[PDB]
Scaffold this active site. Structure first.
Site, mmCIF file in Angstrom:
data_model
loop_
_atom_site.group_PDB
_atom_site.id
_atom_site.type_symbol
_atom_site.label_atom_id
_atom_site.label_comp_id
_atom_site.label_asym_id
_atom_site.label_seq_id
_atom_site.Cartn_x
_atom_site.Cartn_y
_atom_site.Cartn_z
ATOM 1 N N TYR A 1 3.630 9.252 -11.960
ATOM 2 C CA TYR A 1 2.577 8.456 -10.795
ATOM 3 C C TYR A 1 1.909 7.444 -11.733
ATOM 4 C CZ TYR A 1 -0.818 7.545 -7.489
ATOM 5 O OH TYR A 1 -1.565 6.907 -6.415
ATOM 6 N N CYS B 1 0.783 -1.136 -0.077
ATOM 7 C CA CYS B 1 0.098 0.009 -0.111
ATOM 8 C C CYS B 1 0.925 1.305 0.124
ATOM 9 C CB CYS B 1 -1.132 -0.011 1.117
ATOM 10 S SG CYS B 1 -2.477 1.080 1.011
HETATM 11 N N1 LIG Z 1 -5.694 8.382 -1.317
HETATM 12 C C1 LIG Z 1 -6.185 8.359 -2.765
HETATM 13 O O1 LIG Z 1 -6.856 8.944 -3.051
HETATM 14 C C2 LIG Z 1 -5.529 7.182 -3.438
HETATM 15 C C3 LIG Z 1 -6.159 7.154 -4.524
HETATM 16 C C4 LIG Z 1 -5.487 6.216 -5.643
HETATM 17 C C5 LIG Z 1 -4.180 5.475 -5.122
HETATM 18 N N2 LIG Z 1 -3.719 5.802 -3.892
HETATM 19 C C6 LIG Z 1 -2.831 4.653 -3.413
HETATM 20 O O2 LIG Z 1 -3.035 4.326 -2.272
HETATM 21 C C7 LIG Z 1 -1.776 3.742 -1.570
HETATM 22 C C8 LIG Z 1 -1.847 4.482 -0.223
HETATM 23 O O3 LIG Z 1 -1.839 6.034 -0.149
HETATM 24 P P1 LIG Z 1 -2.771 6.693 0.777
HETATM 25 O O4 LIG Z 1 -3.751 7.556 0.420
HETATM 26 O O5 LIG Z 1 -2.934 5.740 2.259
HETATM 27 O O6 LIG Z 1 -1.312 7.692 1.539
HETATM 28 P P2 LIG Z 1 -0.819 8.238 2.823
HETATM 29 O O7 LIG Z 1 0.157 9.248 2.625
HETATM 30 O O8 LIG Z 1 -1.819 8.605 3.718
HETATM 31 O O9 LIG Z 1 -0.035 6.769 3.324
HETATM 32 C C9 LIG Z 1 0.936 6.514 2.490
HETATM 33 C C10 LIG Z 1 1.977 5.829 3.778
HETATM 34 O O10 LIG Z 1 3.060 5.125 2.885
HETATM 35 C C11 LIG Z 1 4.175 5.308 3.782
HETATM 36 N N3 LIG Z 1 5.433 5.426 3.037
HETATM 37 C C12 LIG Z 1 6.094 6.060 2.078
HETATM 38 N N4 LIG Z 1 7.255 5.882 1.798
HETATM 39 C C13 LIG Z 1 7.241 4.649 2.161
HETATM 40 C C14 LIG Z 1 8.618 3.854 2.180
HETATM 41 N N5 LIG Z 1 9.748 3.918 1.336
HETATM 42 N N6 LIG Z 1 8.616 2.769 2.924
HETATM 43 C C15 LIG Z 1 7.425 2.484 3.699
HETATM 44 N N7 LIG Z 1 6.513 3.100 3.859
HETATM 45 C C16 LIG Z 1 6.440 4.385 3.181
HETATM 46 C C17 LIG Z 1 4.168 6.818 4.268
HETATM 47 O O11 LIG Z 1 4.856 6.768 5.465
HETATM 48 C C18 LIG Z 1 2.443 6.931 4.659
HETATM 49 O O12 LIG Z 1 2.099 6.540 5.777
HETATM 50 C C19 LIG Z 1 -0.537 4.399 -2.271
HETATM 51 O O13 LIG Z 1 0.053 3.552 -3.039
HETATM 52 C C20 LIG Z 1 -1.399 5.513 -3.246
HETATM 53 O O14 LIG Z 1 -0.802 5.874 -4.481
HETATM 54 C C21 LIG Z 1 -4.341 6.550 -3.004
#
Ligand SMILES: NC(=O)c1ccc[n+]([C@@H]2O[C@H](COP(=O)([O-])OP(=O)(O)OC[C@H]3O[C@@H](n4cnc5c(N)ncnc54)[C@H](O)[C@@H]3O)[C@@H](O)[C@H]2O)c1
Ligand SMILES: NC(=O)c1ccc[n+]([C@@H]2O[C@H](COP(=O)([O-])OP(=O)(O)OC[C@H]3O[C@@H](n4cnc5c(N)ncnc54)[C@H](O)[C@@H]3O)[C@@H](O)[C@H]2O)c1
Ligand SMILES: NC(=O)c1ccc[n+]([C@@H]2O[C@H](COP(=O)([O-])OP(=O)(O)OC[C@H]3O[C@@H](n4cnc5c(N)ncnc54)[C@H](O)[C@@H]3O)[C@@H](O)[C@H]2O)c1
Ligand SMILES: NC(=O)c1ccc[n+]([C@@H]2O[C@H](COP(=O)([O-])OP(=O)(O)OC[C@H]3O[C@@H](n4cnc5c(N)ncnc54)[C@H](O)[C@@H]3O)[C@@H](O)[C@H]2O)c1
Lengths: 259, 259, 259, 259
Positions: B166, B89
């Site tokens: 992205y 994730c």
């Molecule tokens: N939030 C949205 O609208 C959305 C929609 C499309 C895709 N996504 C995908 O969902 C996933 C989760 O995103 P989110 O919304 O929870 O974001 P977020 O920023 O809330 O959480 C992402 C987490 O990833 C961790 N992280 C970052 N780099 C890291 C690393 N090198 N090693 C370990 N952990 C690491 C961060 O510490 C953070 O807590 C991602 O892969 C994102 O691309 C999110």
């Protein structure tokens, strides 16, 4: 919670006397829903609804007959007061080449028309009348009035030799999913489609053991046909988390139907 | 039943200290799983795992660091005895044009490399090491030893202006899904991908209210951002419904990100 | 006519010393274009450009080295005055499982990183610098300044066992196509991607006759590998009709790579 | 060369009296093909075939009438001696919601049936009878006897509100493409589909200037409607490049039709 219960929801399932439709009916009843099974008078719908209990009724109708679909849904309204879920599952499957080049014989094109009538027109007819019943509902906490779940097929993507008519009908169901979700967006009616791979249903009962073993060999993992309960469970999950909308979900054990 | 319970399953969730990863962690914990959240030492992972209770541990690691991922997963094995589920994730999101034509300035290409390192290399690293742990399990009654769930994005399909890097990283995750499911097919490790739409997480925290209203306006229905519990509920359904394999599931309220 | 000629257009083709890139170079030169072949100093690029004539130059560079790509493109500008077409074709292909479950051995994850570096980062690096050269052009009759044609692979959709890293890099190229087309929409730079099936190139020269015959057996029709000229002709068609944009085109004789 | 000339090829174009069909007819005629336009007696097909000259004939027929299609294709065989190419282009487009929730009125479901009859049944009918004629050809040097080119629409993927029936019919054409290519694989008949975006044809003639400007605003680049010659040019490329098979090609200026 943002996820809702299935308890007390009213669902119509077309093709529900058999196979995947029956799998969805059983799973919904098991989780507290009222279910109307819509299927042909020649089907075993009455016997199936009897064994499934007092929260399940059988509304006989052909999905290609708009007046019969109207009355089935009006009986659902009389019996259960409302409709919350409509599951489009009735379908037929032919296998034929459009022109046998070796023997110089054209197919019977009316088999294309019947495939399109049951598998596509029936979904539109059921969806239209389900929407009419949904519009009687008050918007719920999420602003929703109903959900339409259509059953396509991975044949919409992996269509094999002999399946052009079937794959066309299933590709039509894929294509209708997003515009219908957009049509009903601000009416609170979601539209989602499931594309099953190969499932162990009467549709596949004509196949002999050699063909069954060959089809199972193609499924990567789990290496088996799907079981109707797994389709029913995905139907239920679509019912319960409202952020699924406008999407087609392949349910197939990673199968890609080969040339 | 063909659907299993989550109770007792051991799940590693990368990015688990925030947003969707935390959403998946909480959902699995509430349904009886043991959950290890893998996230950066700079995150709030320790406090979040404390909040989530005794069935949750925090394994600090960067997914870009193979030795840290291996170490974290050894900790999971020491604490809970096995691994059943890995949720990829963790990810980052930049917005930039490759060349600003009006100002005649190239982008910082290393921002593309970082996107690919965290979003793709990290998924490959976690998947390979999770597979190592799965291989120590005995095949269960469905012939399975584990399941890997990747978080892509609808940007893999609907990539907007500024999102090429992205979208590329998310398109990579889409592309890896089927070959990995095929790789592990006879080993009993499924690979499934979720493509979220817009969800209410810290990834979107920077955007002022005007941008939030605009993005909400785009989502057809439900007309809101997704909430993390709906992502976690879909994660759990994939965990429990074994016939989901090799597929990408859009979870987006029917959103199609426009130009 | 709304379609333009290739005559007098200047095209860069990465990986142009070999295989599909050389096929595109030959087809473009055959139709009156100036072509710069970008390939490694270890390649036969100099010999190939010599045999291809005075409208073809060889600009040595590694696509993973941004400074080398910058100078190659600056040599194209010196030699030919402008750039009209950039064809991203350089790529590498590995085959490996992330974890061999039978022998309990992890892959070398650096092979994933190298795949992503050449096949993805190189496309971004070449696209960024090509865009810089395009921005020097005046908008033509159609409002256009250039076109970027990327070479993905049906592995982005049909990835087989062993191909997870390759399929990820090719899925990344799929995912970048639409956002890049959107980035450059009002700058007049189109972005289109070709997904070849199996083509008879040095990339496939390690395979012995038994494997070649097996791969040919999989291609429905024409029942053969593609030939580089057919890829080059599709490249040329994308160059000539401007309404192709933001799309991935499968060129594969209806092949679907099986499990 | 692996790419053949169009000169001398005999092509049937349904819907050839107007819009895209006429665009394909003119392009093939200008490159030396013999073209029969198949269109309704109420169309301007006679006058259009006169305009297009001595290498063009008009065969009146409705694609929904199998006997008329067979008769028309016999005329093509009598006049030009063989058939090499069939372009399925004839189609209709309605806009309607299945249930108007605000006014509580069901749509006219027979409008769905008509859409499916012309847009899908007509393609199946033309394809089957064209296949009958192809089977009288000898395999050429690429092993081919003919090619069928279907016109779907990006509405198969981007279906808007009001477009469920049209999108379903176009999704059907997408779905039929691969199984038909597989059906005829060893017979040497390719099947390829084009999914046009918005093109400047009589199908869009009703829309006032405000709607035209709005729709143009959506197309990223070229920021205009497609012109019929660009559709005909892609038709010709498929005719000449034999390794295109079983694919759907979006031709749309990167448009993604929004909600
Ligand atoms: N939030 C949205 O609208 C959305 C929609 C499309 C895709 N996504 C995908 O969902 C996933 C989760 O995103 P989110 O919304 O929870 O974001 P977020 O920023 O809330 O959480 C992402 C987490 O990833 C961790 N992280 C970052 N780099 C890291 C690393 N090198 N090693 C370990 N952990 C690491 C961060 O510490 C953070 O807590 C991602 O892969 C994102 O691309 C999110
Ligand atoms: N079973 C599979 O392997 C598989 C795979 C992909 C998709 N599907 C799709 O799943 C759906 C259900 O398939 P199944 O396996 O349950 O098939 P099934 O034959 O077991 O059930 C189909 C049911 O549809 C009913 N039906 C047929 N025509 C009808 C009509 N005009 N009006 C009302 N009911 C009618 C039949 O009476 C029957 O009970 C179908 O749409 C099928 O195309 C099946
Ligand atoms: N050939 C096929 O069957 C097939 C199928 C699908 C897609 N593709 C894709 O088509 C493209 C071309 O494949 P091909 O068959 O021509 O392969 P090839 O091996 O014949 O040619 C690849 C070329 O890329 C060059 N190259 C490698 N690394 C480079 C770098 N760092 N900088 C610059 N040049 C570099 C090599 O020197 C070589 O000349 C690749 O992107 C490949 O992934 C190939
Ligand atoms: N024009 C666009 O923007 C656009 C984009 C997407 C898809 N399409 C598809 O392109 C194709 C061509 O449409 P067009 O823009 O040229 O429209 P058009 O109205 O200009 O031409 C369609 C032609 O089909 C003929 N036709 C209709 N019913 C027929 C029947 N039963 N038998 C024989 N001929 C019949 C009509 O007489 C007409 O000349 C259609 O399949 C359409 O769905 C068009």
């Amino acid at each position: 919670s943002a996820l809702r219960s299935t308890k007390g929801l009213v669902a119509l399932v077309t093709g529900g006397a058999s196979g995947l439709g029956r799998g969805a009916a059983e799973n919904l009843l098991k989780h507290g829903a009222k279910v109307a099974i819509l299927d042909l008078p020649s089907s075993a719908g009455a016997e199936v609804a009897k064994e499934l209990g007092g929260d399940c009724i059988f509304t006989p109708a052909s999905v290609t007959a708009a007046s019969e679909v109207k009355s089935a849904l009006a009986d659902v309204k009389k019996k259960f007061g409302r409709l919350d879920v409509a599951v489009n599952c009735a379908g037929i499957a032919y296998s034929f080449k459009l022109f046998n080049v070796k023997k110089k014989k054209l197919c019977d094109l009316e088999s294309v028309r019947k495939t399109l009538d049951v598998n596509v027109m029936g979904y539109f007819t059921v969806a239209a009348h389900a929407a009419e019943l949904f519009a009687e509902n008050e918007k719920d906490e999420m602003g929703q009035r109903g959900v339409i779940i259509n059953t396509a097929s991975i044949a919409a993507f992996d269509g094999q030799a002999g399946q052009s008519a079937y794959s066309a009908s299933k590709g039509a169901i894929v294509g209708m999913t997003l515009p219908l979700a957009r049509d009903f967006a601000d009416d609170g009616i979601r539209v989602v489609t499931i594309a099953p791979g190969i499932f162990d249903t009467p549709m596949m009962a004509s196949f002999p053991d050699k063909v069954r073993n060959f089809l199972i060999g193609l499924v990567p993992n789990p290496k088996r046909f799907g079981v109707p309960e797994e389709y029913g469970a995905l139907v239920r999950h679509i019912i319960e988390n409202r952020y699924l909308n406008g999407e087609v979900i392949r349910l197939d054990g990673a199968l890609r139907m080969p040339a």
